């Protein structure tokens, strides 16, 4: 969904109105799982439960409609098991369920070497500094989870 945003900036003076168009995802829900050493995860959850600053969903005008810490941390061996363990809650009795479930997972380097194939997509979302602004590329691979095939 697209939003037309106009900026008057500062209003010696002249008619300078910035032109902008923002893209928004309407009626979408995402689940983000981060894997790390247990103490850091516990501290991250504790600080999330007590947010010292106004958190949003990418832009200040996008507040969270559901609690970020609604799902509590737990011990799960693999990301697929964690994703399949949580049940899906239907909004009402008869609604079109998503037969295709896109997913994003970190590409495991394993041992030394094992270069990513040409079919692995690139993503520039790792910030280290903003002067000059540079984001290190990352590799993202896509997987499938389907309900009704592993649970009777």
């Amino acid at each position: 969904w697209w939003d037309f945003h106009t900026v008057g900036a500062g209003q010696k003076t002249r008619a300078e109105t910035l032109l902008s168009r923002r893209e928004y995802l309407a009626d979408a829900s995402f689940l983000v799982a981060l894997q790390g050493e247990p103490e850091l995860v516990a501290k991250l959850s504790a600080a999330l439960a007590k947010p010292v600053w106004a958190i949003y969903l990418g832009r200040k005008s996008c507040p969270p409609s559901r609690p970020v810490c609604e799902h509590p941390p737990g011990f799960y061996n693999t990301l697929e098991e964690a994703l399949s363990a949580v049940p899906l809650q239907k909004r009402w009795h008869n609604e079109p369920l998503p037969q295709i479930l896109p997913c994003v997972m970190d590409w495991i380097p394993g041992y030394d070497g094992e270069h990513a194939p040409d079919d692995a997509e690139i993503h520039y979302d790792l910030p280290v500094s903003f002067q000059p602004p540079r984001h290190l590329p990352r590799f993202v691979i896509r997987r499938e989870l389907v309900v009704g095939e592993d649970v009777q």
């Binding site: 969904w1 009626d27 949003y56 005008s61 409609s65 609690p67």
Partner: protein, 255 residues
Amino acid sequence: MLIEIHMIQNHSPANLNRDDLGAPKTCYFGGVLRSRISSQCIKRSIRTSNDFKALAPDIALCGRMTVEAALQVAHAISTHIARPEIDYFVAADDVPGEDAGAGHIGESMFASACFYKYFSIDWEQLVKNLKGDTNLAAHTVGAFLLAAAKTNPSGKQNSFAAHNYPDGILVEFKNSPISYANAFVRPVSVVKESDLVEQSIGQLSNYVNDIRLGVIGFWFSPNNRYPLGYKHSKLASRNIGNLNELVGAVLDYIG
């Protein structure tokens, strides 16, 4: 601590926010097209208000080139399906001529909706840039509350005099920022025995009661016109019928 303000405002047929083509700003939610007023529109409506004009002024409340303004506002999500309409208009020539009709003969776009407005202002950072002026911070919080209650976007207002005030404002002090937009995932359908505002407030009350049952919040309605739960149980902390005492209660709870 966090101050979260939820408003249920029903607007007369108007064109408050516009895109390039003149259509009212729209959004999608719950499988239903929904009307929308942008957050920046509401923020600018808050600014340039004569109610407040009559540290560094104009800097602490809004930054200017950091400042990291503590007030956040969500997009005004309507509780129901958007219903855009065509306003066929002509501009007369009011002189005797060889032809008739003179204006652009356009098709103005307008819609009327009951919007759910979400304002979340954090007290800690607003104190942080106020150099610890707790009294001044409370004063500016109250001024912003009054403005948001009694101000409207300055859209196409000369032809659409939409100056309706909210029928319900709910202030909570919860730790995490939770928006009640999901209360209206099911679009509100008006029934013969109820109205749109009452049904929207009832849906908000149902969402507030749910999840938690399986913090406290101040509920304000003008003269208790729309009660958020007609029971004597512990459901709402205080039912406030006047705006000024609501601001006073918020102020002495914060300080």
